[PDB]
Every structure is written in C-alpha cells, then in structure tokens.
C-alpha cells in the first residue's frame, strides 16, 4: 500500500515536503535530511 | 609447497624437453583449482546447503562463495537468486597443498578406487574430477555428515592441449584409468 505522506521539519514543525512511500516496505515513519526553507538549513524531517 | 617443488624441479624440465618448448614461458602449469559443490537440496532445506558449505570450508581451508541461481527454474522448484551451489577457488600455495592432499590421501580412500578417468577434459587442456562422495577428505570426520554428497573439482592449467594437461597432471601424480 503506497500512500502520499508529508515530511515535517522536526525543528520548526513546518510541513515542508510532500512525498510518498509504500507502508509495507517502510512500516515506520520516514526520516530524511532535507533543506528547511523557513530555517534555511538542512534539518531532519520526519513523516507526520 | 612440496608439490610446487616437485613441479619446478622435475616436471618443468620434463615437459620442456618432451614438447620442445622454445622458451620456458611455454611450460604448462596449474593455474587454479575451482572446487564446485552443486546443491539443489538447498531448495528443500537451506540447512543442507549450510552443512555442505561447512564441510567444504573444512576441506578447503577457505570460506566458500555461495553461488546463486542466475535464472528461475520451475522444473527444480528453483527461484532466481536462490543460494544453490557453492564453490572455492584455490591459487598458489593453497592450490598446490590441496592438490597434493587429493592425490595422496583423498583419492585412495575412495571405495574400490581404480583411479580417475582419463577422458574428462574440456578439450583445451583443463581437467575436472567428479567426486561421487565426501568422507574421503580427512577433515569430514565421517560422522557429522547427515547427508553424503560429492563435488566437482576443476583443474585449470595453461596447457593448450589435453595431452599436455594429462601428462602434466600425471607427472604431478594422477591415477588415471
């Protein structure tokens, strides 16, 4: 089951990115180091 | 190293003379020994492959590489990439030691051993011995074996012709039939 997901910056809680993932292949919340435009630096974003 | 010593001392001059080699570089030599262990039973239970790998490692002294099925085959209940079959590659000193042990100890212990075949050649000068059963190698321990299995040992040499390979292998010691 592949679903659209939102990656939110952990630092400022800003829903910066939209992506998608297969729940079965990745049961746990995804986490990626992405650039947060609000904070203007690379931060850890975790699916919401 | 004994087999290597025997090669360089006796075999190399003998082959040079027999085949009138202009330069010593022409001398055929054993390049590598590839021992292959085909285990289709891994499909039924991977523990058969595990024990085969363990026995092979004990025999060879090197951890074997576990080959995988390049193509799925339904006839054998085989799936592509399944870890069926293992092999070990021996070169240099380990190659010579294993061949020497095979000639001296392993081969005689074969039941009613009348020698090895003399037609099992690729046609280029490389030989392959199909061992029917283990327990001929002293490291197998004759009891741990829950399932008896064989193997296929491939002697690859720089001989262009099967005749040179046979003579070289004979001089190194090979009980042909």
């Amino acid at each position: 089951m592949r679903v659209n997901i939102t990656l939110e910056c952990t630092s400022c809680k800003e829903r910066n990115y939209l992506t998608n993932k297969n729940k079965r292949n990745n049961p746990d919340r995804l986490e990626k180091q992405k650039y947060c435009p609000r904070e203007r630096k690379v931060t850890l974003h975790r699916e919401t | 190293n004994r087999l290597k010593e025997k090669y360089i001392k006796e075999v190399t001059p003998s082959l040079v003379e027999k085949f009138n080699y202009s330069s010593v570089m022409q001398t055929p030599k054993v390049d590598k020994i590839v021992i292959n262990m085909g285990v289709g039973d891994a499909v039924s239970n991977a523990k058969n492959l595990d024990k085969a790998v363990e026995e092979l490692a004990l025999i060879t002294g090197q951890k074997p590489l576990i080959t995988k099925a390049k193509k799925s085959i339904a006839g054998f209940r085989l799936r592509e990439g399944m870890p069926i079959g293992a092999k070990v590659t021996l070169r240099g000193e380990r190659m010579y030691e294993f061949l020497d042990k095979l000639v001296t100890v392993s081969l005689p212990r074969v039941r009613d051993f009348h020698g090895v075949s003399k037609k099992a050649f690729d046609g280029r000068g490389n030989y392959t011995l199909g061992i029917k059963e283990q327990l001929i190698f002293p490291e197998v321990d004759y009891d741990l074996v829950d399932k008896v299995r064989g193997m296929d040992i491939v002697i690859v040499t720089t001989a262009n012709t099967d005749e040179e390979s046979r003579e070289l292998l004979a001089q190194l010691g090979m009980p042909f039939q």
Partner: protein
C-alpha cells in the same frame, strides 16, 4: 588453456570513459598519467590543439629514484614546476583509468603541493 586479459587494455577501457568527461583545453590542460610496471609518466596536454604542453617521468634522470611511490612524488613535483614555467597553473587531472589510490595519488598530491591548482 586460460587467457589473462591485457591489463593495459582494461585500463584503456576505463580510460575512455574517464576521458568522456575529462578533457584538456589551452587554459585548463589535461594532466594525463601513464603507469608502467617500472615507471610512471605524466603529461600536460591540450586536447583542442593535441599538443603536450609539459612532460615529466621517471626517466628524466633528475629524479633520484627510490620506491616507485617516491618516484611518483618526484615526477609530480617535476611536472608541476615545468608546467608552471610554461605558464600553466590550473589543470584537470586524468587518472588514465587507474585507481586514484597509490602511485597516482602520490603523484597527484606532489603536483598539487608544487603548484598545479586542481
């Protein structure tokens, strides 16, 4: 019967792919490295003109020698200074299809230290 592939041929197969994205200009020449079992050779080339601006190697007789790695360092220093004399500072380093690990890496570091910017 078994054929051992020519190591130089395999090197060149890799080297073509490297050259697909590394090329030498008059103002940014190509630093090409050739590694032999005995020696190592470096050239500074302008592919556009197809002329070697500078050259050095273990046979210059100005390299006192030693371990092949140390000879590579001497070659790097010598080629860098010769290129500087001819007015070259920047270059693009072609590893000749080799692995940027040993003698070639030593030569590259020597060139960097002795003045070639890359």
């Amino acid at each position: 019967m078994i054929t051992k592939p020519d190591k130089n041929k395999t090197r060149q197969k890799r080297h073509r792919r490297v050259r697909n994205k590394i090329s030498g200009t008059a103002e940014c020449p190509r630093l090409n490295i050739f590694r032999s079992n005995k020696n190592i050779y470096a050239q500074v080339i302008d592919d556009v003109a197809g002329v070697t601006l500078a050259s050095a190697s273990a046979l210059d007789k100005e390299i006192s020698g030693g371990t092949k790695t140390e000879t590579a360092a001497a070659v790097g220093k010598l080629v860098a200074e010769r290129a500087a004399e001819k007015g070259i500072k920047k270059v693009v380093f072609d590893r000749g299809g080799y692995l940027y690990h040993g003698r070639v890496q030593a030569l590259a570091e020597a060139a960097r230290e002795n003045g070639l910017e890359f």
